[PDB]
Write a protein that holds these residues in place. Structure first.
Motif, PDB file in Angstrom:
ATOM      1  N   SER A  22      39.124  33.465  33.080  1.00  0.00           N
ATOM      2  CA  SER A  22      38.793  34.764  32.507  1.00  0.00           C
ATOM      3  C   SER A  22      39.160  35.899  33.457  1.00  0.00           C
ATOM      4  O   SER A  22      38.647  35.983  34.574  1.00  0.00           O
ATOM      5  CB  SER A  22      37.304  34.834  32.181  1.00  0.00           C
ATOM      6  N   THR A  23      40.042  36.780  32.994  1.00  0.00           N
ATOM      7  CA  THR A  23      40.503  37.905  33.794  1.00  0.00           C
ATOM      8  C   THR A  23      40.777  39.116  32.917  1.00  0.00           C
ATOM      9  O   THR A  23      40.994  38.975  31.712  1.00  0.00           O
ATOM     10  CB  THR A  23      41.800  37.537  34.516  1.00  0.00           C
ATOM     11  N   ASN A  24      40.760  40.305  33.514  1.00  0.00           N
ATOM     12  CA  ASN A  24      41.044  41.513  32.752  1.00  0.00           C
ATOM     13  C   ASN A  24      42.467  41.387  32.222  1.00  0.00           C
ATOM     14  O   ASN A  24      43.361  40.932  32.934  1.00  0.00           O
ATOM     15  CB  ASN A  24      40.961  42.762  33.636  1.00  0.00           C
ATOM     16  N   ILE A  25      42.682  41.783  30.976  1.00  0.00           N
ATOM     17  CA  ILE A  25      44.014  41.714  30.395  1.00  0.00           C
ATOM     18  C   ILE A  25      44.529  43.102  30.043  1.00  0.00           C
ATOM     19  O   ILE A  25      43.805  43.925  29.484  1.00  0.00           O
ATOM     20  CB  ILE A  25      44.027  40.859  29.109  1.00  0.00           C
ATOM     21  N   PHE A  26      45.782  43.364  30.386  1.00  0.00           N
ATOM     22  CA  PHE A  26      46.386  44.642  30.062  1.00  0.00           C
ATOM     23  C   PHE A  26      47.891  44.482  30.019  1.00  0.00           C
ATOM     24  O   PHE A  26      48.497  44.024  30.986  1.00  0.00           O
ATOM     25  CB  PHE A  26      46.023  45.706  31.093  1.00  0.00           C
TER      26      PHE A  26
ATOM     27  N   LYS B  35      41.848  43.516  27.604  1.00  0.00           N
ATOM     28  CA  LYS B  35      40.451  43.122  27.580  1.00  0.00           C
ATOM     29  C   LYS B  35      39.852  43.325  28.959  1.00  0.00           C
ATOM     30  O   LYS B  35      40.432  42.911  29.966  1.00  0.00           O
ATOM     31  CB  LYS B  35      40.288  41.656  27.194  1.00  0.00           C
ATOM     32  N   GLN B  41      36.984  43.427  39.169  1.00  0.00           N
ATOM     33  CA  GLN B  41      38.022  42.446  39.459  1.00  0.00           C
ATOM     34  C   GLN B  41      39.359  43.141  39.691  1.00  0.00           C
ATOM     35  O   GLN B  41      39.764  44.002  38.912  1.00  0.00           O
ATOM     36  CB  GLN B  41      38.136  41.467  38.290  1.00  0.00           C
TER      37      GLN B  41
END
Lengths: 326, 42
Positions: A22-26, B35, B41
């Motif tokens: 799970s990681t920030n997505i962009f 997201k 992070q």
């Protein structure tokens, strides 16, 4: 005419990246799309269709002739901001000095994709790297610096692409109101984050289909931000249940008084789209069976990799974001 | 100054993993999407 194709491409690709971590997505759908849609121009046979199709296009229905014709207008349009909005996109084609292109290819990318072409010497991998990184840095106004860090010495041509966006909230947040609050990552993991706050009328509404709350923040200009806040244990659902039209509906809406808490963000995504794009059918172009005849009749070619980097900044003033494809 | 009763609006807090995308109003195309799982992070 192709907006839906993109919209769905964005979701297709997204679901892949969401599954992979799970990681920030962009990422920038438009960016990745026009970069490959542009490449296809010099691709043939399966390698060709494979690309176009992976971008969520049904070759039978909408002819490629009209697909490219569409990217042409989408690009021309994304480049005429509402003055109060900054939005730019550039496509560059770097060719190795000793290369015999295929006239048609150069006339196409330059015509359908408003592409620029330059002649670097990949033999001097440091200078070639400098030229490209500079092009991207300039276009993304400093947001995306050294995009290329490792460039092949035998590289025949690089097809770069960038997108820049800077807008102001149509109803900004006051910096004095921003305080440090809790942000719940897990059901047992909380991190402190500078939370932006504002009380007033918002376009917030709870779509039942997505089982999430949909908030719409307009930007002074011709842009809008859509935030989807999933109901307890329904994020996975939200992600899977997204579709173009559903996003078309929210926009037709009303308003309501509420006290909003939106964290200010500084996140960046970097990707090696080979693994992900293959998952969407695009594999040929990356193999020793790729057909790039459309670019050069010289020797056979193929993609050694597909790097994408996007960077987002969300504060009280508004949002700034850049995306680059290399 | 005339004071009247207020209303206490509801709090909408995005303090949990959420999704989002950016759309260009004319073309209605997805400029960006992503997201936020943990804003800290890097």
């Amino acid at each position: 005419k192709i907006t839906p194709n993109l919209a769905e491409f964005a979701f297709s690709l997204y679901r892949q990246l969401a599954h992979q971590s799970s990681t920030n997505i962009f990422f920038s759908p438009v960016s990745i799309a026009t970069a490959f849609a542009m490449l296809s121009l010099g691709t043939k046979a399966d390698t060709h269709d494979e690309i176009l199709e992976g971008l969520n296009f049904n070759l039978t229905e909408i002819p490629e002739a009209a697909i490219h014709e569409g990217f042409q207008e989408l690009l021309r349009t994304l480049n005429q901001p509402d003055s109060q909005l900054q939005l730019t996109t550039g496509n560059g084609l770097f060719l190795s000095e000793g290369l015999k292109l295929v006239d048609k290819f150069l006339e196409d990318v330059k015509k359908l994709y408003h592409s620029e072409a330059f002649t670097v010497n990949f033999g001097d991998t440091e200078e070639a790297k400098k030229q490209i990184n500079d092009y991207v840095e300039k276009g993304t106004q400093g947001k995306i610096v050294d995009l290329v860090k490792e460039l092949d010495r035998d590289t025949v041509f690089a097809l770069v692409n960038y997108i820049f966006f800077k807008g102001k909230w149509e109803r900004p947040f006051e910096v004095k109101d921003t305080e440090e609050e809790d942000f719940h990552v897990d059901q047992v993991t909380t991190v402190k984050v500078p939370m932006m706050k504002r009380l007033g009328m918002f376009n917030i509404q709870h779509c039942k289909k997505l089982s999430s709350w949909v908030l719409l923040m307009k930007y002074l200009g011709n842009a809008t931000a859509i935030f989807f806040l999933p109901d307890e244990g329904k994020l996975q659902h939200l992600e899977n249940e997204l579709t173009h039209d559903i996003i078309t509906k929210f926009l037709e809406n009303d308003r309501r008084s509420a006290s909003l808490h939106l964290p200010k963000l500084s996140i960046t995504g970097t990707y090696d789209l080979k693994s992900v794009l293959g998952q969407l059918g695009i594999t040929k172009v990356f193999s020793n069976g790729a057909d790039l005849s459309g670019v050069t009749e010289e020797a056979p070619l193929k993609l050694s990799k597909a790097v994408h980097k996007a960077v987002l900044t969300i504060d009280e003033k508004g949002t700034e974001a850049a995306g680059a494809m290399f | 100054l005339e004071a009247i009763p207020r209303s206490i609006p509801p709090e909408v807090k995005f303090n949990a993993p959420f999704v989002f995308l950016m759309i260009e109003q004319n073309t209605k195309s997805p400029l960006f999407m992503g997201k936020v799982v943990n804003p800290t992070q890097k």
